[PDB]
Amino acid sequence: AGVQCTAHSWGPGRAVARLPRKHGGIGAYANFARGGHMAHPTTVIRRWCRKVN
Amino acid sequence: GAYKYVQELWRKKQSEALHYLFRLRTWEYRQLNAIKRCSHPTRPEKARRLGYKAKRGYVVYRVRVRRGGRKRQCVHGISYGKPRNIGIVGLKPSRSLRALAEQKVGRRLPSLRVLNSYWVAQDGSYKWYEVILIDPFHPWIRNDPKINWICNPVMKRRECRGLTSAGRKARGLHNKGIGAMKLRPSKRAAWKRNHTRSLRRYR
Amino acid sequence: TANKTLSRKLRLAKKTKTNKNIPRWVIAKDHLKKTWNYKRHHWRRSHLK
Amino acid sequence: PGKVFNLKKGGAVVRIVRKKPHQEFVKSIIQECTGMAPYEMHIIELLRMNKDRHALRYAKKRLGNIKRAKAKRDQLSVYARNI
Amino acid sequence: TPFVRWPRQVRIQRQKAVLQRRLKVPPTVNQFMNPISRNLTNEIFNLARKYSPESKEEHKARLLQISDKLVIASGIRRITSLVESKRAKLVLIANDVDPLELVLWLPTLCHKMGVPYAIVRTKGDLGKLVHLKKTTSVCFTDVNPEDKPTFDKILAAVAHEVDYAKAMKTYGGGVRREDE
Amino acid sequence: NQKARDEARAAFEGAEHIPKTFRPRLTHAMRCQLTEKQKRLLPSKLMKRKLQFPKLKYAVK
Amino acid sequence: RKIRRRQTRLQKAKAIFPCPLQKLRPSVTRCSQKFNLTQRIGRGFTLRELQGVGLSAGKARQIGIAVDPRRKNKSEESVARNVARLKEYLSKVTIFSEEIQQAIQHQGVVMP
RNA sequence: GGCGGGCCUGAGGCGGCGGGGGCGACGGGCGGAACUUAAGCAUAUCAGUACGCCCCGGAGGAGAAACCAACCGGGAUUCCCC
RNA sequence: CGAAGGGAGGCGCGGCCCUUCCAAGGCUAAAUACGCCCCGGGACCGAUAGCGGACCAAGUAGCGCGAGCGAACGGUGAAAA
Numbered sequence: 001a002g003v004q005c006t007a008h009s010w011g012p013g014r015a016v017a018r019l020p021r022k023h024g025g026i027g028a029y030a031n032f033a034r035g036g037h038m039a040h041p042t043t044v045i046r047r048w049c050r051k052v053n
Numbered sequence: 054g055a056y057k058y059v060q061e062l063w064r065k066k067q068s069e070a071l072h073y074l075f076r077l078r079t080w081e082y083r084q085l086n087a088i089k090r091c092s093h094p095t096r097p098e099k100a101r102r103l104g105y106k107a108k109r110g111y112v113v114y115r116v117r118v119r120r121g122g123r124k125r126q127c128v129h130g131i132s133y134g135k136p137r138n139i140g141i142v143g144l145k146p147s148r149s150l151r152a153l154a155e156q157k158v159g160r161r162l163p164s165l166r167v168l169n170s171y172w173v174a175q176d177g178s179y180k181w182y183e184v185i186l187i188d189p190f191h192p193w194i195r196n197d198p199k200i201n202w203i204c205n206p207v208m209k210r211r212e213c214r215g216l217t218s219a220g221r222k223a224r225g226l227h228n229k230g231i232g233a234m235k236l237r238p239s240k241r242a243a244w245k246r247n248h249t250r251s252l253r254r255y256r
Numbered sequence: 257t258a259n260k261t262l263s264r265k266l267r268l269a270k271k272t273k274t275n276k277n278i279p280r281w282v283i284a285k286d287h288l289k290k291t292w293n294y295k296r297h298h299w300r301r302s303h304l305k
Numbered sequence: 306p307g308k309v310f311n312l313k314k315g316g317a318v319v320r321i322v323r324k325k326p327h328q329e330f331v332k333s334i335i336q337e338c339t340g341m342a343p344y345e346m347h348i349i350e351l352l353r354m355n356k357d358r359h360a361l362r363y364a365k366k367r368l369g370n371i372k373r374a375k376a377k378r379d380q381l382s383v384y385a386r387n388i
Numbered sequence: 389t390p391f392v393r394w395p396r397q398v399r400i401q402r403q404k405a406v407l408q409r410r411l412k413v414p415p416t417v418n419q420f421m422n423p424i425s426r427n428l429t430n431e432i433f434n435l436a437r438k439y440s441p442e443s444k445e446e447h448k449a450r451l452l453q454i455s456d457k458l459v460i461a462s463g464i465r466r467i468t469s470l471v472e473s474k475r476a477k478l479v480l481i482a483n484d485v486d487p488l489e490l491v492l493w494l495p496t497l498c499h500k501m502g503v504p505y506a507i508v509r510t511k512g513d514l515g516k517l518v519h520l521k522k523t524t525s526v527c528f529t530d531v532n533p534e535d536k537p538t539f540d541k542i543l544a545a546v547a548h549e550v551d552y553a554k555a556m557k558t559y560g561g562g563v564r565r566e567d568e
Numbered sequence: 569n570q571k572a573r574d575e576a577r578a579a580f581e582g583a584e585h586i587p588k589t590f591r592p593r594l595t596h597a598m599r600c601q602l603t604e605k606q607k608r609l610l611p612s613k614l615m616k617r618k619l620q621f622p623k624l625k626y627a628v629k
Numbered sequence: 630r631k632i633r634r635r636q637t638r639l640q641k642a643k644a645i646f647p648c649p650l651q652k653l654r655p656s657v658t659r660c661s662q663k664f665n666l667t668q669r670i671g672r673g674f675t676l677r678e679l680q681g682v683g684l685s686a687g688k689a690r691q692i693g694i695a696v697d698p699r700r701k702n703k704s705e706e707s708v709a710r711n712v713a714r715l716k717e718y719l720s721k722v723t724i725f726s727e728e729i730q731q732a733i734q735h736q737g738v739v740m741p
Numbered sequence: 742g743g744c745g746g747g748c749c750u751g752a753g754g755c756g757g758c759g760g761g762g763g764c765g766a767c768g769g770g771c772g773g774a775a776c777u778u779a780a781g782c783a784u785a786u787c788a789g790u791a792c793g794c795c796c797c798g799g800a801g802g803a804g805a806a807a808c809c810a811a812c813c814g815g816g817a818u819u820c821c822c823c
Numbered sequence: 824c825g826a827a828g829g830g831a832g833g834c835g836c837g838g839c840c841c842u843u844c845c846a847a848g849g850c851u852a853a854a855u856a857c858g859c860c861c862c863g864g865g866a867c868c869g870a871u872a873g874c875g876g877a878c879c880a881a882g883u884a885g886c887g888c889g890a891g892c893g894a895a896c897g898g899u900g901a902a903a904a
Binding site: 057062064068 | 327328331332334335338339340342343344
């Protein structure tokens with residue numbers, strides 16, 4: 001999710017923030033970008049079950 | 054009892070008589086093509102040891118492999134990157150030239166299944182090996198309980214999956230016990246079973 | 257172009273034949289409320305091929 | 306140390322397990338037909354004169370094992386006596 | 389005229405013959421390239437015809453629905469056992485066997501056991517005797533009381549013409565191109 | 569078509585090598601497989617040992 | 630997974646109702662000095678142990694007794710423990726050639 | 742010398758039957774990186790990984806000891822716990 | 824370069840034992856893995872979220888010579904009355 005697209009930082013001199021942008025110039029690949037990955041994606045490796053004696 | 058004598062005559066490979074016979078053959082083989090259909094095994098005793106039976110659906114082909122070390126295919130000889138990974142001539146193939154001979158006859162004839170191969174002759178330039186291949190759709194083979202397993206679909210192009218004797222040697226499967234405990238289901242599979250993180254429920 | 261191949265011409269023909277709007281009865285039959293065919297092309301603005 | 310220390314080892318009875326001519330005949334017919342390899346002929350020349358350490362040294366290089374080369378030295382010796 | 393570029397297979401087979409007449413063939417191989425005389429070959433072959441197994445057509449009417457006649461045994465594996473057991477009284481081996489290593493040791497094991505042997509010409513001819521396309525070796529093990537005088541005559545000329553001692557020392561090998 | 573296909577099926581019915589259109593459906597894999605008679609064929613020696621030591625029913629108390 | 634394998638054992642048990650799911654297997658001393666004085670189920674009875682109960686390898690396999698040709702007895706005491714195993718099983722076994730329905734299938738390791 | 746046969750090695754054609762190509766997984770065979778970690782960097786690590794190529798199957802591979810051990814010993818393979 | 828009885832016992836070499844096995848041929852089920860696809864469930868997401876794509880026509884419209892890139896757009900009402 002959010003990583004299926006091809007986005008690269010436009011660079012440092014185009015008057016735009018350095019976040020990754022799609023070919024058109026659309027913000028991508030970040031928590032703050034619409035369509036971007038979760039900053040820390042939720043995962044099934046969480047221990048769902050605890051232990052009791 | 055004849056085949057006992059041939060096994061011992063063929064243990065004397067540098068014998069004056071075998072030397073003439075193997076010089077005459079290494080000349081003939083050089084004159085022919087790399088993969089050649091042979092009307093019969095040239096080595097009947099070794100073919101019979103490795104399975105060949107003189108019935109229909111049993112074919113022998115001689116494959117010629119070029120002798121020598123490998124040169125990595127990198128343009129201009131340059132393999133960029135880390136210095137350990139440099140070096141293009143003098144590298145050594147990971148599979149015997151016997152295994153290559155069986156992979157070469159598999160590609161030329163993908164309609165046949167490979168059983169086993171044996172050394173026939175060598176020169177400084179080339180080494181010749183004869184491969185016994187089986188037609189898995191012949192009536193005699195399908196109905197013969199001894200070779201009927203070659204007709205199973207899971208034995209399709211066995212050389213391409215390292216399942217012939219020479220491929221098995223190159224995968225380290227002739228060795229068993231200490232030395233071979235990280236190459237048993239497969240080298241790749243052992244690494245995957247060792248490096249798996251279990252993450253059980255009641256961890 | 258005035259010299260074209262039948263194969264090139266046939267694909268171009270299909271493009272012309274299917275550059276049509278939704279039939280008015282289909283809008284009624286399907287109760288579409290979305291009349292425009294979005295696959296419609298214009299020679300000046302669109303580049304087929 | 307490759308054993309544990311138990312002075313009273315043996316509190317059980319131990320089942321101890323006990324230990325072709327035609328093959329020699331086939332070799333005799335093939336020897337008559339083929340003769341000796343060139344490497345063996347040289348060990349037969351050395352065993353006639355240059356002696357054991359030279360013969361063993363050539364044989365350990367050619368065969369690659371001391372037990373195998375020592376055995377070849379003994380086998381070739383019988384034919385070397387009568388040179 | 390005789391300047392044709394013959395097919396590659398024809399050239400290789402003509403050259404293989406030329407090389408075997410130029411290289412020094414070791415004595416054991418040379419014994420196959422120097423077979424027994426044609427007159428004797430006819431005489432053993434005539435006697436073997438008087439033996440022989442059932443013919444293919446005789447086996448066909450035997451194989452519709454319907455004795456110990458002495459027949460020549462065939463095949464290296466049976467022949468070796470008969471030579472080793474001294475059951476054989478004559479062994480016939482063909483000059484040409486594709487892997488000569490199949491029959492190279494036979495003259496040696498026949499002399500050791502005392503069975504008389506001869507190297508006859510063409511395995512196709514030895515096949516005609518047993519009704520098979522080709523066989524490495526045929527061998528008489530018994531012989532009819534009626535045909536034992538002929539057997540004695542043939543076995544004597546086999547001894548006159550076959551010299552294991554000379555053939556194991558001939559090293560005939562190669563001739564010179566000029567020597568045609 | 570049904571009539572011609574039916575009459576033709578019947579004509580080549582009971583013929584060795586019947587036309588491919590008239591052959592069973594199956595799949596490529598099934599049409600290249602081994603008949604369960606061919607797959608269960610055992611060598612004479614192995615089959616003899618099956619008869620020699622037949623499968624049995626037993627209960628352990 | 631627990632459910633899938635329980636179903637598989639129930640399906641196999643139904644397939645051979647009188648016969649137990651598991652074959653009689655030998656008692657073998659656990660290896661190494663750390664475990665020498667403790668015994669565990671092994672793979673198969675040796676041919677020497679089978680001779681003590683007078684059963685052939687093929688016969689023993691028919692009566693649900695696992696047979697190991699590779700295993701060699703090692704100690705006289707091992708043959709005696711294992712021969713006793715087979716005798717207790719041979720009494721328990723009831724070879725049958727509707728009473729089969731009233732037979733009670735054994736569950737788990739035969740002789741634990 | 743030239744004409745027939747047998748055998749052996751080839752050559753063209755015809756019949757029957759097979760092969761080829763597909764699938765973002767799992768599986769087998771190969772060829773094979775570098776970013777990265779070492780607070781630099783060459784061995785090392787990444788990684789026997791990405792990717793490239795070849796080959797199956799409903800699983801595959803492995804498999805009935807030229808095994809481990811050192812015992813009051815086990816006993817083909819695969820898989821899990823440690 | 825090349826054996827004959829040979830292999831192994833986790834420090835090489837030479838000797839002598841011991842324990843343990845038969846390489847250089849072949850087959851084999853089960854337990855194990857896993858997408859497409861179907862089925863079911865959820866302390867999951869709730870339209871800038873959740874797949875890129877909930878919308879009659881999404882890998883679509885559009886863009887790039889090409890490899891390839893790739894959107895946006897849910898909701899009248901109980902009934903279209």
